[PDB]
Design an enzyme around this catalytic site. Structure first.
Site, PDB file in Angstrom:
ATOM      1  CG  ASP A 157     -43.000 -84.755   8.841  1.00 31.66           C
ATOM      2  OD1 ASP A 157     -44.041 -85.225   9.155  1.00 31.66           O
ATOM      3  OD2 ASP A 157     -41.906 -85.196   9.213  1.00 31.66           O
ATOM      4  CD  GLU A 163     -33.443 -81.092  13.607  1.00 32.45           C
ATOM      5  OE1 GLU A 163     -32.822 -82.093  13.771  1.00 32.45           O
ATOM      6  OE2 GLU A 163     -34.675 -81.300  13.831  1.00 32.45           O
ATOM      7  NE  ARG A 208     -30.414 -84.738  12.690  1.00 40.16           N
ATOM      8  CZ  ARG A 208     -31.559 -85.228  12.565  1.00 40.16           C
ATOM      9  NH1 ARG A 208     -32.494 -84.712  13.356  1.00 40.16           N
ATOM     10  NH2 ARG A 208     -32.061 -85.879  11.314  1.00 40.16           N
ATOM     11  NE  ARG A 255     -34.820 -90.740  16.392  1.00 42.22           N
ATOM     12  CZ  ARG A 255     -35.200 -89.758  15.765  1.00 42.22           C
ATOM     13  NH1 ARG A 255     -36.584 -89.573  15.987  1.00 42.22           N
ATOM     14  NH2 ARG A 255     -34.544 -89.459  14.673  1.00 42.22           N
ATOM     15  CE1 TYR A 290     -35.698 -85.279  16.383  1.00 42.21           C
ATOM     16  CE2 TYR A 290     -36.741 -83.313  16.518  1.00 42.21           C
ATOM     17  CZ  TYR A 290     -35.985 -84.309  15.733  1.00 42.21           C
ATOM     18  OH  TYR A 290     -36.128 -84.053  14.357  1.00 42.21           O
TER      19      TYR A 290
END
Ligand SMILES: *[C@@H]1O[C@H](CO)[C@@H](O)[C@H](O)[C@H]1NC(C)=O
Ligand SMILES: *[C@@H]1O[C@H](CO)[C@@H](O)[C@H](O)[C@H]1NC(C)=O
Ligand SMILES: *[C@@H]1O[C@H](CO)[C@@H](O)[C@H](O)[C@H]1NC(C)=O
Ligand SMILES: *[C@@H]1O[C@H](CO)[C@@H](O)[C@H](O)[C@H]1NC(C)=O
Ligand SMILES: *[C@@H]1O[C@H](CO)[C@@H](O)[C@H](O)[C@H]1NC(C)=O
Ligand SMILES: *[C@@H]1O[C@H](CO)[C@@H](O)[C@H](O)[C@H]1NC(C)=O
Ligand SMILES: *[C@@H]1O[C@H](CO)[C@@H](O)[C@H](O)[C@H]1NC(C)=O
Ligand SMILES: *[C@@H]1O[C@H](CO)[C@@H](O)[C@H](O)[C@H]1NC(C)=O
Ligand SMILES: *[C@@H]1O[C@H](CO)[C@@H](O)[C@H](O)[C@H]1NC(C)=O
Ligand SMILES: *[C@@H]1O[C@H](CO)[C@@H](O)[C@H](O)[C@H]1NC(C)=O
Ligand SMILES: *[C@@H]1O[C@H](CO)[C@@H](O)[C@H](O)[C@H]1NC(C)=O
Ligand SMILES: *[C@@H]1O[C@H](CO)[C@@H](O)[C@H](O)[C@H]1NC(C)=O
Ligand SMILES: [Ca+2]
Ligand SMILES: [Ca+2]
Ligand SMILES: [Ca+2]
Ligand SMILES: [Ca+2]
Ligand SMILES: [Ca+2]
Ligand SMILES: [Ca+2]
Ligand SMILES: [Ca+2]
Ligand SMILES: [Ca+2]
Lengths: 387, 387, 387, 387
Positions: free
Chosen positions: C69, C196, C211, C286, C320
């Site tokens: 990433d 975040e 978070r 999720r 997200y």
């Protein structure tokens, strides 16, 4: 109004990354030109990227490299900085296989050379309208900077070469106002060689650092004022800057002969007696890149330095590089800002494909904290057409 | 305000290259239209390229050519000069299989002809709004210039043909103001033939050079003022200009009968008694291109000239060509600058494919040094769809 | 002039759909980037979508996901809201693998972090010109909001983290004026974890909901004024908001330990003592999304709601989510309007492909009638490259 | 300023062609959306084309036809008139499976309906900002015009339906000012059916012609002023206008029952007692198109007309059609010019593919000479994905 360009470069301590376009990685599937010799130049409102294409899209049968570099198909175009050069977001500039361009604060000026090797003619455009031409005077190849030209108070300056690329040649400096050539003199430099100069303005004058392709492994320079009165010499540091080059040792201000023939286009900045040198890590092939700061490098021959910052690791490919600046009318500061760009070549002759291309990254100098890392190209060769 | 157009052409000695788009080479992989009859026209701010497509992309099964030239699918579009014509950067203009367009200084005017062969109707648009129509007056194929129309003091002029293409026809001159037809007269020319005229303004009048498709191998011309009072004749030089044509010899000012039963659209410029002639190198097929300067060519029947400049070699394909000018309001001079364009046809009937298309190059006349070379198309046929 | 931002959120009763781009469905055939972490931010004239790409197009061999990433290829770009992100309609912003951006009423500000994990450096750009940098102060992964920053009276605010992601870390709040850092303090929060954050302005102050990735299944918050004087706590409701999380029960105002040690980026809005909570339907993966309205949720520990509205069904993938607002200078009202966006992830690790990507939907709150439905992604995996 | 719209339609004698985009022929190779229900609407500066996509490109596996018409993927977009709708030149408008849009002289208004079949909610946007919503009042499929809404003096009007599509329903007229609903009444029409109305302004009032889907083969109409006082009836001519329909015979002013129970969206213009009727050539399937002029058609029941003009031949496919106008502020006349568009459907259910799509042509009425021809679609089915 026009860019005044009567300010000095302001102090820096490091370089921060500015852009990265990822040309080849995207061009594996999308429609992206096959380019070489990219460069960046900024107006008083934006910055653009110029490049030279041959009319072929990456990963296509027309990208077969049997077309010569000086071919009747190459063109000059431009796209916004940081984008992949494609036929759906690019502007047409001129037809050329050697070029340069700068902005005087009112409109764009572009120079483009095309024609046979004994009759090449340079076509000057100002705001998209042809205004003047220059024809070769010694009947060998007429070539030019391959990076941005420098404008001070409405006048813009450039340097041209015509003659052998392994012997004595002929050199000229041109002064251009609104696309018309106003004055020109030819340099009197025995035992010097100048190719692909990268020029920047500083305190109302011009300084250019060029490439010696005959017997030099360090770099030459030339500086002149608005009336064209010049001075010549070589960089007197012991950290050699060309490629190929010997190992670091005792330098000299007259041409250095060891490993001199051949080279790569490069740059440097002058700060009093110091100098910022940008050179490849490998001494024999175009791999890596780094920035050096030698506080007495412009006039002293030792090989001791103060700060080094890494840009690309020694295991990855690199290429040409040059300089550009951002005027106070654009950035709002009271000093001229220095920046630079690098080109990353993939393909022949060092790899087994049928094409060759390049992408770019660019940095701009600051005074706050920075870091050194490696930002390579990252494409996975060979492509489908090669198989 | 409107373009005044009360100035004369200014002296030139050669031509410099202006643009080259590389349509087919790019269209091998990307998305590029299949076009024919391109032309260039300039406003007081920019220059654009117009063309006629049939709705098909290059290298696709719909590009098969069982489609007539006069088909219900063709359209007129435009893109900035020097770019490959693709559906992602082109503007829609009109629905037509024969067209022309010019700019009066305020807005674009376009003319487009569509319909059956015995009832074709021309639709005139001014700034994108339909304003007037013209219907065929002899119930035969109606056709127009295929290049830019000429505007002087706001009014814009064009020439139209309707009748047989191997015999006597009917000819008309139209005067248009703001998209409305204001006046028209029909030419009284027995034993003349006019098709696909290319017109330019000069010192407040209009001069057009056209193509004789019935019994002529040299070219006819017509000139008129703003009140439509015309004069007719043929170019009296011995350097024939059409294609096919005989060998160079003693010319005449009445139709030359030898080899005069077909042709190609062309142009010429008048300078006192001299003339600049642009013609193909081969006398039987469309190969090559060159520019000639005969100092007494408009009135004398002698085959001797002074200057020749090469544009494309005799081994490469060419096609249509025409003229356009750049007004002082655009270029800033006190001239009326002359320029021209050429079309390079690839595909049927001279090659073994299923399609046919063309790309373009264009030049503009200057007074400084120039060079002659060859700038051919360069695509490698046949394509994938053909196999 | 600058956005004043001295007004309060105005009452709402439901959410209406605003945009949907269909990125992957289009990207099956066309040229579409591979993106993650999209977000939306609005100026005083328009709204745009920002995202982070790795340089690869969808359905290409360079989309093979062995790139980390934090890689030297990721960039930040932007395209108009509601469009598929492609290289032919996107703007280049900065080089980063963690970012945020907001508009102060005059020009865009962007923040981008790049470099090694022990030396990352954040580069601040104002109107496309580099102005300042921030370097990591604890030599661990430096990271930022991943959504829009909040501007009040010209000044813009953001929150940054540097330290372990499973233990105590270090936290800072920055105040930025015209791209220059003016003031900063570091939070004193033992046993809290902030990552975040999604911030919005309300009545001249700032409120952020973040978070907790160390031992929390409910969410933390922080609020401060223009002089940086902050207040900390946790959301005291019994409707837990993180993911993974336990079943609904009796909530707490200090970290809830059960199933705490991970999370996903989220948001919430404060209305007096009530709260609008946006959370996924599934308590372990999720999947799904919904909006809850607990009239006493900011300070009371019961678990009883009043209104629920469905956004995506429990059988479909989500990810997200964050918040953004529309200022009165844009919308013409007298109140700050709240909105939000959601990201829909497709690909690894829950599916058998080689890539991973996401598309987005977004909603804006109103006071009239609304409805609840499901607007999932809809792509049919696996793609051609996977086979 | 706002469009006054207090002028009458000006006399015409025929129709001239205006645009043609060639969507499918281009979409065989390029990237083109899969669309349905296109329509055209004009501001005071330009004209645009709106359409409804499902998120899939032509010639792709996501274009299968198992997705319902009311699906959570459809969106409303727009592109300049006469261009192929692609994701690289289109603007995002709203998320909807039924829509309309009009321009009041200051900004665009769009209406979009989405949601389940018993709770659909219409979202009204003015200049890209959500302003109001309307929710279904009978819990059945809510639907709207599918063509442009009509604006007079700053207010814009539209008609909506909610109820069974084979029985009695509920009908409403809405008045909108700056994106806010100001007034609404519901029609009292026993034994009438209104769907997909096409409205135009004339002399300060509004007239709409709609589709009867329950027991009618001729068309209904409704007219009202700015205070919403309406009048209802049927077109009393003997040239039936719907599809399917019986043969021409003696018409009636009350529902005609023969072959009534279905239809297709259409239009008509009123000139005193005459009427211009646009209908398909085939009486049982959607093939062909033509324009009729019956000088006493609005009130008399005979079946004799005066002028017919052909648009598409009887062997080619057609579909929906509607009307739009060009205001004097745009065209510069003292009229209200009438125009219309047609949709050409290719694919299921009449052909053996897996997808379905449509392209468009459009005409505008004039007073000079015209011609009748056929301008069909021209694509060669089936495509590659079908094989
Ligand atoms: C340079 O010129 C500019 C404009 O002429 C002037 O404002 C500035 O003070 C001058 N001084 C410097 C920086 O040399
Ligand atoms: C490149 O050109 C050479 C001949 O000049 C040819 O043999 C080779 O096959 C070409 N490669 C491709 C992919 O066309
Ligand atoms: C700069 O340009 C101005 C205007 O041409 C001229 O008056 C002046 O002498 C020039 N020189 C400088 C650097 O002031
Ligand atoms: C054309 O007319 C304009 C207006 O008087 C004048 O300025 C211009 O010089 C004229 N040009 C020539 C060369 O006749
Ligand atoms: C071109 O058209 C001809 C005649 O219809 C047909 O026989 C031929 O197969 C076509 N070629 C292609 C590639 O479709
Ligand atoms: C140009 O046209 C305008 C408008 O008719 C006219 O007034 C003017 O006199 C014309 N100029 C000449 C020199 O004919
Ligand atoms: C916000 O401040 C402005 C002045 O900057 C004032 O006019 C306005 O009424 C204030 N609004 C509120 C809601 O406080
Ligand atoms: C993806 O990457 C892995 C690791 O290098 C490699 O083994 C695999 O073959 C790659 N797959 C594709 C499609 O390239
Ligand atoms: C907003 O900031 C300006 C300074 O740019 C200041 O003068 C003004 O008083 C501030 N307004 C308030 C209400 O704080
Ligand atoms: C329409 O109204 C305007 C004033 O708004 C008036 O000037 C114009 O003449 C009217 N036109 C007609 C045809 O009624
Ligand atoms: C179209 O959908 C049907 C139903 O799921 C499926 O069986 C068929 O294979 C699909 N066709 C394609 C090309 O995917
Ligand atoms: C048009 O609307 C404006 C605003 O309501 C009004 O003042 C004007 O009188 C109206 N004009 C007519 C003729 O109704
Ligand atoms: Ca050397
Ligand atoms: Ca030293
Ligand atoms: Ca002839
Ligand atoms: Ca002669
Ligand atoms: Ca957690
Ligand atoms: Ca509660
Ligand atoms: Ca019916
Ligand atoms: Ca009748």
């Amino acid at each position: 109004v026009t860019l005044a360009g009567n300010s000095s470069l302001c102090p820096i301590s490091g370089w921060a990354i500015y852009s990265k376009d990822n040309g080849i990685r995207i061009g594996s599937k999308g429609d992206v030109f096959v380019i070489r010799e990219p460069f960046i130049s900024c107006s008083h409102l934006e910055c653009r990227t110029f490049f030279l294409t041959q009319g072929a899209l990456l990963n296509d049968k027309h990208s077969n490299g049997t077309v010569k570099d000086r071919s009747p198909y190459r063109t000059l175009m431009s796209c916004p900085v940081g984008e992949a050069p494609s036929p759906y977001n690019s502007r047409f500039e001129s037809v050329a296989w050697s070029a340069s361009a700068c902005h005087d604060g009112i409109s764009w000026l572009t120079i483009g050379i095309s024609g046979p090797d004994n009759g090449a003619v340079a076509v000057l455009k100002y705001n998209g309208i042809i205004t003047d031409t220059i024809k070769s005077w010694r009947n060998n190849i007429l070539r030019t900077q391959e990076s941005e030209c420098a404008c001070v108070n409405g006048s813009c300056f450039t340097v041209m070469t015509d003659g052998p690329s392994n012997g004595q040649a002929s050199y000229k400096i041109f002064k251009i106002e609104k696309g018309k050539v106003v004055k020109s003199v030819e340099m009197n430099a025995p035992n010097y060689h100048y190719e692909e100069c990268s020029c920047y303005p500083d305190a109302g004058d011009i300084m250019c650092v060029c490439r010696d392709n005959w017997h030099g492994s360090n770099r030459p320079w030339v500086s002149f004022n608005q009336n064209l009165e010049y001075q010549i010499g070589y960089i007197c540091s012991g950290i050699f800057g060309d490629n190929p080059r010997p190992n670091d040792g005792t330098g000299s201000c007259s041409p250095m002969p060891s490993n001199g023939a051949y080279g790569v286009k490069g740059f440097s900045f002058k700060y009093g007696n110091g100098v910022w040198i940008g050179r490849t890590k490998s001494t024999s092939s175009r791999s890596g890149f780094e920035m050096i700061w030698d506080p007495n490098g412009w006039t002293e021959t030792d090989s001791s330095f103060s700060v080094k910052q890494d840009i690309v690791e020694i295991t990855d490919w690199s290429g040409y590089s040059g300089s550009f600046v951002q005027h106070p009318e654009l950035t709002g500061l009271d000093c001229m800002r220095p920046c630079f760009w690098v080109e990353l070549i993939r393909g022949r002759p060092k790899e087994n494909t049928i094409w060759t291309s390049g992408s770019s990254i660019s940095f701009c100098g600051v005074n706050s904290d920075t870091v050194g890392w490696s930002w390579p190209d990252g494409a996975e060769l060979p492509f489908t057409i090669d198989k």
